[model samples]
Target: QDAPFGTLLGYAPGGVAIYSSDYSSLDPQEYEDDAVFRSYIDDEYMGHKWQCVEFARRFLFLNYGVVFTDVGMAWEIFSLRFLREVVNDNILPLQAFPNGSPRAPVAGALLIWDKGGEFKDTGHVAIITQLHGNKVRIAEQNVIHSPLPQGQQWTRELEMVVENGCYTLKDTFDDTTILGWMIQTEDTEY
Candidate 1:
């Protein structure tokens, strides 16, 4: 049988970028080097970052008809509407404890981080895909997915920085240079 729906997450070049909140278009906006995220807080669809990302994620999964692991700079095209609320509703409970596992990266698993352990604190979220040698490739919208060496230049190239891990989805959110989610490609199909 073929792999499950939305199971082939990888990156490609030259697609329109979307953002988190309101699904705004990021192609025309001016951005700093590596800084790809734009705020839709002032728009009519304010306060919707999580939902926008979620919508983009689901849209890419269901409609785009591709299994893209790392979508580079595409996050800016979507608006950042309802991200806070959607994330809080979906992730806050899971944040209450330290949950780790060795299961192969799935299509809909949430990758989250919180630096300082605050009660109402949920840092960032991304779709887990495969974990490379030192980096975890994710199907994140409104963000850039640089390749091995190219993806690790967050300091020099702001657009290449990825903030997720493979092993421990931490509440600390400080380990930027390590691979957290290692995807399995041997046994089960993609």
Candidate 2:
């Protein structure tokens, strides 16, 4: 039997599902090289060799033309409510919504997980690319390499429930609990 690719859950019964989107303008290979690990102070979009943070920064830079300050851990990216632009001297604030918040998942939002067990102290970060009824598709890196058979992107689709205007995600591989989503907004209020 052949193993699954891309959306892992869709291929198997009761397995993790995934959804891929064609919105990313950046190529995965452009930053997939694990040989390179640049320091956070370097100011490069891709922070370090194929790390989760590198992918998130690269995704935002390629899609929204924005970059955020360097963070020591993947979970730290959530504390930042604002991101800085590379070209223009502008700031974009991303509201951090904890799990069970009234906010619904939207495309371009950053899904974050807290530090624990398999995640270590750094946690994880992934960019939301698509959203559907009880489902969300995210584009991420480092967690899984070579998402598709002939592609390099890593996308994971998961089950979620919205109740009373709050969103709660089901288990995503090994009992990982999502911290919440960070969405870009002009308003600073959470």
Candidate 3:
């Protein structure tokens, strides 16, 4: 490829560039320290920025594959751009479903967590990978990394329920009352 797709833009174990760029772009001067902090996210955490999600989706489309739905999670910049790319390329349509509905999680199908239930505060979106009944496993974006100073990390194959609400206040899903999602980077790697 002409640009860096499978390396800085590709998926890998301990993949740092995408996360690094996404996080560092938050506080350009603090990215080095932030990069170190991002290295310790568990399998159940998401980053704290839409850039993180954007990077993740870009990585997914470039690496794995793209699929769409008649109904998508909602209309977010990242999701919308992703869907547009896929749809323009003749992929699937990222559609949306009403709240409190059970849609089988499929790979590339966005699992959204809206308000109501435990996630009655903010809404979150993650790509589905595996589904076992009501529990859907996904690669969530914009999740807090740890309990220390708090970091951002992307969780792959993380299992959680599809709830409601969008994280408009901050990017943090479960702990928006604490930290918020940061916007970093302008490069369209995906």
Query: Which regions in candidate 1 have their CA more than 4 angstroms from the true location?
Result: 1-17, 20-52, 55-99, 114-122, 139-166, 169-190
> For candidate 3, what is the lDDT?
0.36
Tens-digit lDDT track of model 1 for 1-190? 2222222223322232333232233333342222333323223222223232443345333433322232223322211211222222321111111234334344333443332222122233455444444344444432332222333311111112223432343322334321223221222422
Off by over 4 Å in 2: 1-35, 39-43, 150-154, 187-190
Cα lDDT, model 2, residue 132 = 87
For model 3, residues 2-120, the per-residue Cα lDDT tens digits are 22211233222233334223342345556434544332232322232233344345444554444222222223322342243343465333434333334333554544554333344
Top candidate on TM-score is 2
What TM-score does each of the candidates earn?
0.31, 0.73, 0.40
Superposition error at 139 for model 2 (Å): 1.0
| TM-score of candidate 3 relative to the true fold | 0.40
Model 3 weakest lDDT span, ten residues long: 176-185
Selected candidate, larger lDDT, 1 vs 3 = 3
lDDT of each residue in 81-147, candidate 2, tens digit only: 7888877859877778888877787887888888986677879988777778988877675565434
Ranking by TM-score: 2, 3, 1
What C-alpha lDDT, on a 0 to 100 scale, does residue 122 get in candidate 1? 26
